[PDB]
Design a protein around this ligand. Sequence first.
Ligand SMILES: NC(=O)C1=CN([C@@H]2O[C@H](COP(=O)(O)OP(=O)(O)OC[C@H]3O[C@@H](n4cnc5c(N)ncnc54)[C@H](OP(=O)(O)O)[C@@H]3O)[C@@H](O)[C@H]2O)C=CC1
Lengths: 337, 118, 83, 113, 71, 208, 95, 229
Amino acid sequence: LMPHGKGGRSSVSGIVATVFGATGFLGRYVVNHLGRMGSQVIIPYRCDKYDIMHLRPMGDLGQLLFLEWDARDKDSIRRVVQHSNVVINLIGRDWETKNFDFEDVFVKIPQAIAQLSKEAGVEKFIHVSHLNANIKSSSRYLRNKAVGEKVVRDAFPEAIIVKPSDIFGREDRFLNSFASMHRFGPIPLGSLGWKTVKQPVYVVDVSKGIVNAVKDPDANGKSFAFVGPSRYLLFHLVKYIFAVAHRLFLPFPLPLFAYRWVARVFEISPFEPWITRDKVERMHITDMKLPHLPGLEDLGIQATPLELKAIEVLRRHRTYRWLSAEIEDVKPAKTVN
Amino acid sequence: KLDITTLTGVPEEHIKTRKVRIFVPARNNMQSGVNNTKKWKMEFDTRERWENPLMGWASTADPLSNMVLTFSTKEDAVSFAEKNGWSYDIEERKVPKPKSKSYGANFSWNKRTRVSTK
Amino acid sequence: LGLREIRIHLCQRSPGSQGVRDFIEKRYVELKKANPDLPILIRECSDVQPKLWARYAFGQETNVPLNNFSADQVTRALENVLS
Amino acid sequence: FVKPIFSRDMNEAKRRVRELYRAWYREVPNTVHQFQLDITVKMGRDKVREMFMKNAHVTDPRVVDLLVIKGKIELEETIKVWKQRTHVMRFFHETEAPRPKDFLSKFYVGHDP
Amino acid sequence: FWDVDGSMVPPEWHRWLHSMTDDPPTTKPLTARKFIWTNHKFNVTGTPEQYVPYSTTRKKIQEWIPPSTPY
Amino acid sequence: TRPTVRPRNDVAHKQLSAFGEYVAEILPKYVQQVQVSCFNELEVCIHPDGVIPVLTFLRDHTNAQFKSLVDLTAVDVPTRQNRFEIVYNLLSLRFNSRIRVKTYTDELTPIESAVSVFKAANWYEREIWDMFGVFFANHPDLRRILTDYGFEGHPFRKDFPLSGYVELRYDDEVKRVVAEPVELAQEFRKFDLNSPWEAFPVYRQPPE
Amino acid sequence: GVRVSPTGEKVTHTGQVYDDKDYRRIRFVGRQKEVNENFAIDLIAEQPVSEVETRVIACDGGGGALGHPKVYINLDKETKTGTCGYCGLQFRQHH
Amino acid sequence: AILAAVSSIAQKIRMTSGVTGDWKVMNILHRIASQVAALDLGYKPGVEAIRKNPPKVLFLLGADGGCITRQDLPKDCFIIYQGHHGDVGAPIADVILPGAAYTEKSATYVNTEGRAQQTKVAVTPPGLAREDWKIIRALSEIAGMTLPYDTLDQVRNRLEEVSPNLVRYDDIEGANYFQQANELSKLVNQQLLADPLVPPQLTIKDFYMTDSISRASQTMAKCVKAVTE
Ligand SMILES: NC(=O)C1=CN([C@@H]2O[C@H](COP(=O)(O)OP(=O)(O)OC[C@H]3O[C@@H](n4cnc5c(N)ncnc54)[C@H](OP(=O)(O)O)[C@@H]3O)[C@@H](O)[C@H]2O)C=CC1
């Protein structure tokens, strides 16, 4: 169908999303943005009914749908994508689950989703990789994205390839881990952070951008690479993270392999690690500065600086002596440009 | 122009977007009763109301749409729309013109009224 | 460019319209005779002032009000707008 | 004509509003910290300047003074640490979509007026 | 059992536990009309059986038919 | 004329009437109509500039100690320029009498506050302030009763929709409850049950 | 034996089943659309037509004050049955 | 010919006198809902002899298959359309632009007596249909020649600076130009009278199918089949 009513929760739009990865961090956001517009949204889930219960407010009566399905089965994926007009994809896992090898997460599954999306006659199959995807010996998960990027690029050739970099949000793994270091005590870094630089991307912007990307006919085979407003060097970046966390800061150098070993000690747990050999290099990798790829403002959405977003994300960690403190007083981290 | 545009709580959007309709309501065609032609009333212009995707219900846009207001006189209603800041359109009263009638007027060979069997 | 459509407005009863009324009752047959092409639309409307629209190239229009003008002055404007 | 609320002519009223602005303009950080607003404080002061702009077409001193009566009454609920953070954020409407005043987009959206 | 609940009772006996009727349906069996259900399926909010509200009374405007002929 | 009909109590109507002229004597300056229906229910006008001086007198004995402001019942009729119709229900306990004494006001008329006189109207105050906008003489606080915090509207103005313009809901990424534009489903499907053909000729305002 | 839609789900007794294009059909997935087995329509004409040699008749729907208001069915035309405005069941005057 | 004839007839009956003279004896019954306003704006006589070379004619309704068809331009058949029912005109057209029905728009209409009376909004257009002239203001807005007025109330504001009678509703009355100046150019032409003279509608059975709504209405089909057999 086609839109009716003022753009809101009760007004309609023709959207029929099938957001894989809704269970995770980004997914609840993108579902919030599809749902806020009054578009109906399928939400296929595997974790459990309880895990996504919090999403129920986001919809309005009929606007949301929930669907259990096995990743291992193909036919279930066929069922969930049937009436889909658009099919957003967000399946991933940084630390690599034991029972499901990391390979499948960015190879077999994205491909099946792509072919079946083609059979579904999906108006807009969409896939989200990362700005660091060009093949690197570092970060197999990062390396795997490139293969998923291509397989998705082929099985469903007009698929968009989103490449967000270090999106930071309230529940972001990347921002929180840095904040969580105070419990660790000491602050190791691979040759500190001076060699490497990053340009982190705010998540609500990425989500609303996915929405407007769905809204744009013009995008198709386009390989979007989302980028942050500012290109901070990693070390001064951590400086800022505790500068707002107000926690004691004691940086020191640590060899990449030696840090890699401790990360390996932390990978032993079936319980999810705060640290992993993927995370090591995925941190130590620099963000590529790409101009040629389409701008964020092409979607019409302005980039939102981390300094305007940080304290809410990190207030929970700052001590009561600081937990009620004014925002302006931390002073912004130094920019490489 | 004693505008109470801010003194009222109404959104500026609903006062900008539309004019209201001042008028005197019409008598039922299907019914004899003249009784509701009396007393002026003012009503806002209807907007689009998309169907509810579920259960096929009405899904109204503008909240204020069901408003209705009686008035003793026309200048009264004009005064309200002026006080309140909304645009309006005055409409005239429609009392039917008197018609001469008589029982015998139906008859008479010459008048070609005649009617017929009774 | 000189004209495409021309038109005038006129109070039905007002004194400032009356000489113009007398004019339309007379010479308008002559002026209308002069121009088989370009229309000279005329309106009865009791707009507060008698009026003179005259479209030219690309829809642009002159607009001289005719309040308190004698029909001779009206015509005096009329030859002026032949082009 | 009819008897005035408080101020008569604009200056008796104009005096009251400035009293109001400072009454907000100083109060703002207090609010920024009581509710721990994530907004930078200058944004707060800017909003303070903006709500004082929406009332620009006011011309009757009874309308001015009644507006500062209600505005100070809102300041009551603000200073007493009543309301909640959400109520403070109601002035922003940030959840809501931006409105394109452009008519062409208004054509593109829906039936509308 | 170890999942027993309400709605397990049949409607006649459902009238009987609530003591709307002193007399058990045994003595006075009910009308047994053709269209009434027999197994009595009880409440089922979970599981694949599940009520679904939906749009009723078909269509509205009937959108105009596109031509199939070229030119 | 009886089994269904409620009997008409002429006696109390007589006494209330006579007392009504009595009061009509006593305060010519503000008192106007002396309405006296067969419900045994007396009523009287007051000019708004005359709110306090009358009411105080009422509390004090003459032959009716109008103790206890039971109500400041309020009505809004948009037609009249004096749209507001503030009403003082009253009850002289010693005389077991009841009376209804009302007024009128415009949107910017600071009608007198009986807060000093009754204090019961510390809230009849703020409700009838808030629901309306009937500004009041001098009250310790005009902070709103009932309606929320940032809420702008004045429901019971018999103006703007019964749903109102406002409909709040919790929202996700803002982590908080937020007011939003209405979007009612199904809509209040109002029935116009008004009946052409008058049933009460005895009433009936003349066409004039 | 409700008529089956091309999608395979049964149509409502007021026929209106969703189009194959229709995305909305997704709602029924993982669940069961429900439609009544006992259409009243068949049951209307299923009944034998009552006939009385008289003339005007008075149906009550069976059950005094347990059914429709008393109604006087005419039988002026033997060319047709006298269906009730309420019961929906036919009548005729046999002779 | 019948025009000059009847004008001569009414003038002749004026010559018979006994007429008050303000009687305005000369009058006709229009059956069309649109030509009367277009002639209040005096666009053109509406002569179809124009159907010559022009490519890319725009369709407003275009309900008849008669007066116009795609033989006007042998080359391009590109022809824009903005009706609401698809009958007759729509298929011929290409790059179709859907638009509102009458109750939905608040757009005005002129009675044949010169009475002006606007339509008011009702159920609003069913889907992607919108206000009729709004698409025009959009095309002009893209055309690099945007219209100065914005609201429909403002196009009504423009009607005073041109019509100027569309702004006034119940005002049937006006100055009335009188047969003097009228008749004089009528007699400076003259046309041959002819045979025959038959009403378009003939009988009842033919009366059920005129405009796209009357055409497409199902009650009309059932009713015409009723009057047939
Ligand atoms: N900053 C960032 O986080 C960035 C992320 N990306 C990429 O974008 C995607 C979105 O990130 P994010 O949502 O934070 O990651 P999450 O882990 O939060 O989202 C992944 C979700 O998909 C589910 N899932 C995926 N595959 C399976 C499977 N086979 N079986 C069961 N569940 C599965 C996960 O578990 P379940 O649903 O079962 O709970 C989880 O809920 C990721 O894939 C990531 O690689 C790219 C750039 C930056």
